[PDB]
Symmetry: C4
Subunit: 392 residues, 4 copies
């Protein structure tokens, strides 16, 4: 974690060069008072790439490492050959490359891109204000006022607002302004594109659920389905949103490898499976096969799970909801079942008519094992199969 | 439904503070005439969070609850310590959080976001106009004219229009204007991004259908398909758009749980299945299996459904279209079949050559059951199987 | 096709009212010279809704049908009660609703939306210019110059350019300008959103193919695949783009119903299947099953289709490419096969070692039938099965 | 590769006409000094379409081929009939059509579209500046200053900045400015839409992986999974990003035809399969079937692959990771397995209890063959089946 301090220090040093270099290009006086800071930052930049190689597309580091400054401000070079101090502003490409990889997971990449673009735009605005100040007529005005005027002009130009109170007066000013207008239009377009991209991907799951509900409702409208069934479907979809944001269990768990899927299935269904009379005293591999073949099914309130008198072929394990066991005529409540329990266990060993009616109080979200998968998997574990056959 | 009145009242109170607080910051005279309303709103805000806890990320409520105003306007504090009345404008974060959850289902979330952004932008424009009025030279002008001028300046700045008739004159005005230009560019970019996001998701189904038609047409172009077949396909796809917006039945009904899917299938196919000679007097579970295994198929106008003399293995139930039964030589019309009827019933009990030719008048949209699924499911209901075998 | 003329005439009439009504509101002189056109358009609008009901959300038609004009310009009503002539500009909602449904299939809906927005923006600019002219000081200037000035001001405002040479002078002008600035920002944001939506969906297939190629190349990079195989894959993907725009046959034909799929398969494979020694003299249903079970497979240049000495279980039908039959040692060319021919026919009746080597000159794009599907489908047609068994 | 030189030369010639034609329209003096270049470019354009037909929607070529210039500048035609020299600027449509097909694969098409739009915008700005210069009052000013002023005005207008220092003065200037404002708004909207489209599709894979991780984490949050399992899943997903950018092997290899899939599978698994005691001396087709039926599975660090005492039905081939073979009580390390080796080979010939415990050091990324697929495919190769049965 010691490299984060070095990265932050390098960011501070490059922001220092970004602010001072154009400012001292405009004002050559500011070179002796900030000399020790310049020397210290030059050493830091020289030593950075040794520390970049240790504990790990490269020209920017070499070009910003060597001190092309400290000589143009010492020998007092002319304007054409004084702009070679800005090669040290190529460190930003590397600072941004480091920042986009030491924060690619905690922060949304679109937001990181937008923030980096905003910072680059502010630095470029400072540089453009310095360039505008340089190519101005010499007048006796305070330096702060002349900076606040150049910065006001460049912010007015970059935002495409264009008040017009500060305008070009010389042909060189006009050419510079044309260039700055082009870059300002490009940068504002980039900002708008970044914002539009950031906003498009915000509510993806809500929009997907809304489109699914609209498509289902339109299809049921075509098939002339009664309003009661549509109301039940809309209440289901709403409950799905308020519980799992409209996500089916089967599609989420196909995004995982076999060991992780097995671990999740065990952590969900272990005690509930283990505490079954039929399967107690059986091995762990048989339990794993069952724990891997349970199919999620959500039953709405008042829906029929098992009806009295039907043949029946499935067993159900309650995971979240509640259930009422009732008579054939639905006059007497045998029992109320909650989490951790099960019903329909007397169907994996006999194919007899069912013994009661099962109804749902609220949304159930229970798992189900069919007798076909159970018989399929029972072929490879004959000991249990014998116990089941004797039980029958 | 009593909480909606309270939410609307809280919205009105916070819009009141949003309008009055900056206005009375600019004009300290407006504090006695609106004193009872201020007291009443202060009580409402104090009592709101007791009513927020009952019948249900929290600091904004506490910071807006306490009256940091009513003292800066009573003791006549100076400008640095007079801006502590605006902490009560943090209630907007909670009003927006309530609005985005008491209307997340009726309104498109993108539209709600755009409307909330527009309201926030108007409130911010009022506040920025007040701030611009505050840092103006003292002159004897009517208050309404000075507000209409500050509001004109801030609307001109926020929209990036920039007429330039009203411009900064002092360094403080220049700094304030630079800040306002930056926020105006950000807010306009946000508005444009919201509008682009809202417009991109408008005609999703039409675009999907258009891309499917284009891909199919291009693929048939590669395979050099005759124009008649392409014309038939385009007429089919068009009928699919004018009926179900280009949606396949099988993919729509996989978006539903087993009980809801069973209910929809029963409500679609119940009387049509029930009134079959072969299956009358059979149980409800057998009917449910058939009602669950019917496969949708749309036949175009003039298409062959059953041809005379073929072996044949399927039965068809008419759902929407019309049919003409015709001779082997297609000279005599045996019958015309409409909704609620069926044909090909003498194929689930014998594998004999067919007895007539079936043609479609218009698009049919009929269901079909194959003899393989029927035989598969007949294994678990032997009583019916015996009746079928004796019938054969 | 007579309704298109009526729709175009209604569009012309409503564009006439859109241009004349605000213009004659500004200039009350222009009411007698254009009186017959106004009467004729009023009759046309009165009679339109009788013709809207015949040969087929309704208030706009009734509100634009009755002549609320022809009285405000006849009795010379004052300004508050003179703006009731613009209710007849609600016909645009219906003209646009008709246009978006009589051209929803020929034109891209995004382009139609953009064009409708542009037309509405131009009409609104004309109306806003008229409103700006109305609330101007009375001066003796030519009407054309005053219109060209109001239109210049409104175009400068709506585009967010804001030259500033024409600016408000009165409080009413300032309020009107604030409103127009808000609507101009909204309309420009709408235009930008429409353009971004139109441009995002332009090159969908090319982008999908590019992402597939990038993903495949990156995955092969991880697995350290030799450059020759990567080059072969890239040449394949390129050929897929230059032939079918990167579309797999199997996914395109699952977008069609069973009769259309059968018709396409017959039109592709009919003569090629029919002219097979093994299957000649067989029925049409057997041919249909084969024509429905042929699987597309593209072989690259120089690839092995059948190798000498392998067991072999498949038959291949050439559809587009060319093939070279060669010896076990690949020294002698037995034959060259083109479209309409086949090879490997002596594998659906015996499971013997193969008799030659098959190589591809260029990309083949040939179909393949396995012996498993052939045996599966041969169970239900025993006569052919007997002929095959005797042939073996 | 000789056509690229001709295309570049044609691009240079059309950029020459784009710059000179409006410039010599404004300044009729510049027609004799550049006469030989004009003649040479006219010959080049005349000869281009012969070379367009050889070594290969056409009107632009014919309209730009004939010299409608060289006569309006020779006979000194008036202004209405002097604007017929610009028909030769229709060559740009063909230059762009050539550029969008000789670089559709190396360059992102969105970037190519943006660059072409930028170039067209710069050329249009030059033309608009020339048009603005033409309709200016005659004054004695240097030509360069008048161009730099017209270009400054058109760049200020096109970027929607609108300083306002240069404004219309005549009605013709006002109409021209209104037109230019409309085209500038359209072009800036097009640029913003292009940038937004380019930025939306940048980090597609990272966003897909982020959404998968968010959905999985939310679903596990609903099911109340312990933090240890969630931490293991997040470490897995992270390793998947740092290795294959979040791509599953099975979905990537379904994007390839059977020969390419077979070649990739052979190049991945060949030596590892070949060096197996059970399968040595067997044929190549049997090896191909195995090499086609190996299923990828990634095991995390510390995960159980084979547990001592279980029945066991699978064999594993190590591809990338490392493995530790351990005792039933996990006290003694039998061996450490690296790339190119395998374990569990004594399960495809007997269904005996396993003989050791297999654990993963780091992420493994190993392949697995089940005994069901092996038995399925062993039916069609009886010789090996006999060798396996005798081995058992
Ligand atoms: C890379 C940069 C473009 C630099 C062009 C703008 C200023 C031209 C330099 C110039 O001639 O200024 C003359 C004087 O030259 C100087 O010594 C001061 C130059 C200051 C330059 C400021 C640094 C520019 C920052 C990057 C701009 C983006 C006129 O006085
Ligand atoms: C967000 C970015 C806003 C940034 C602005 C650049 C400001 C730098 C100019 C400093 C010069 C100070 C000046 O002249 O104005 C000062 C005004 O500010 C004050 O009120 C001083 C307290 C002095 O008056
Ligand atoms: C948070 C807010 C930024 C406030 C800065 C703009 C005005 C500075 C206050 C100031 O010094 O005004 C001086 C007087 O101070 C006052 O008493 C009036 C201040 C009114 C402030 C209006 C409220 C601003 C609304 C939020 C702006 C967004 C100059 O006279
Ligand atoms: C959409 C938002 C448009 C909003 C604007 C803020 C207007 C508040 C200024 C009120 C001051 C009244 C004023 O001076 O202009 C008035 C003009 O309006 C009238 O014509 C009065 C009737 C008085 O003249
Ligand atoms: C709906 C419309 C908003 C109309 C407000 C703008 C003009 C106010 C009318 C007015 O007072 O003008 C006074 C005279 O009134 C008139 O007779 C002329 C009014 C012309 C109105 C032009 C039609 C506006 C078109 C819709 C604007 C969007 C001042 O003179
Ligand atoms: C694209 C939309 C451009 C549209 C503009 C509205 C123009 C209407 C103004 C008509 C008044 C005629 C005028 O004063 O300028 C005229 C200028 O145009 C000419 O050169 C006349 C030939 C007369 O001078
Ligand atoms: C296509 C083009 C629109 C051309 C309209 C703008 C200039 C009108 C021509 C005109 O009347 O200028 C008069 C003189 O005419 C001339 O001889 C010079 C015309 C130069 C035209 C420059 C070429 C325009 C480039 C395309 C504009 C986009 C006024 O002096
Ligand atoms: C990016 C595109 C920027 C483009 C601009 C068009 C410039 C063409 C105007 C040439 C005229 C020369 C002129 O008057 O300004 C010149 C100024 O430039 C210099 O400093 C000369 C060295 C002469 O002063
Ligand atoms: N007295 C009871 N208490 C709790 N559950 C019961 C009772 N009687 C029946 N059931 C359950 O109701 C089911 C209905 O018939 P099954 O064969 O599915 O198996 C039955 C049991 O799971
Ligand atoms: N006279 C008739 N009226 C109505 N439908 C008929 C008549 N004759 C035959 N059909 C139907 O036409 C079908 C053609 O042969 P099937 O064996 O499919 O079963 C036949 C019946 O469904
Ligand atoms: N002389 C030949 N001319 C054309 N095709 C041949 C010739 N000999 C063999 N073939 C084809 O090459 C195939 C190789 O072995 P098959 O059993 O697949 O069936 C063979 C035929 O399809
Ligand atoms: N001494 C050993 N060295 C390396 N691998 C072993 C050793 N003993 C067992 N194994 C492997 O561990 C596996 C555990 O039981 P299997 O039947 O899967 O087959 C076994 C071998 O693959």
């Amino acid at each position: 974690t010691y490299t984060l301090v070095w990265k932050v220090w390098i960011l501070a040093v490059t922001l220092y060069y970004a602010i001072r270099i154009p400012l001292t290009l405009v004002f050559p006086s500011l070179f002796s008072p900030l000399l020790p800071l310049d020397i210290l930052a030059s050493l830091a930049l020289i030593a950075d790439i040794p520390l970049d190689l240790a504990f790990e597309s490269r020209l920017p580091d070499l070009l910003a490492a060597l001190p092309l400054d400290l000589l143009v401000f010492a020998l007092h070079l002319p304007s054409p050959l004084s702009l070679l101090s800005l090669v040290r502003l190529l460190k930003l490409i590397s600072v941004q490359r480091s920042a986009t990889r030491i924060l690619s997971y905690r922060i949304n990449p679109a937001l990181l891109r937008l923030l980096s673009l905003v910072g680059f735009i502010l630095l470029a605005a400072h540089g453009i204000a310095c360039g505008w100040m340089s190519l101005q007529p010499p007048s006796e005005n305070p330096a702060g006022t002349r900076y606040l005027s150049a910065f006001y002009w460049t912010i007015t130009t970059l935002t495409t607002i264009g008040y017009g109170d500060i305008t070009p007066s010389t042909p060189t000013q006009t050419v510079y302004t044309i260039v700055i207008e082009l870059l300002g239009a490009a940068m504002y377009g980039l900002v708008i594109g970044n914002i539009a991209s950031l906003v498009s991907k915000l509510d993806a799951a809500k929009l997907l659920h809304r489109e699914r509900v609209e498509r289902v409702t339109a299809f049921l409208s075509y098939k002339r389905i009664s309003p009661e069934l549509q109301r039940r479907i809309i209440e289901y979809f709403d409950y799905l949103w308020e519980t799992r944001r409209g996500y089916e269990e089967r599609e989420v768990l196909k995004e995982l490898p076999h060991p992780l899927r097995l671990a999740v299935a065990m952590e969900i269904h272990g005690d509930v499976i283990e505490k079954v009379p039929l399967f107690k005293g059986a091995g762990e591999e048989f339990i794993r096969d069952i724990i891997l073949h349970l199919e999620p099914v959500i039953y709405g309130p008042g829906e029929y799970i098992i009806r009295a008198g039907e043949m029946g072929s499935d067993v159900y394990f309650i995971n979240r909801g509640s259930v009422e066991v009732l008579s054939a005529d639905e006059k007497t409540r045998y029992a109320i079942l909650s989490e951790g329990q099960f019903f329909g266990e007397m169907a994996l060993i006999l194919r007899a008519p069912r013994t009661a009616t099962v109804r749902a109080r609220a949304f159930c979200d229970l798992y189900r094992l069919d007798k076909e998968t159970f018989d399929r998997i029972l072929s490879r574990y004959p000991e249990i199969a014998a116990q089941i056959q004797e039980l029958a």
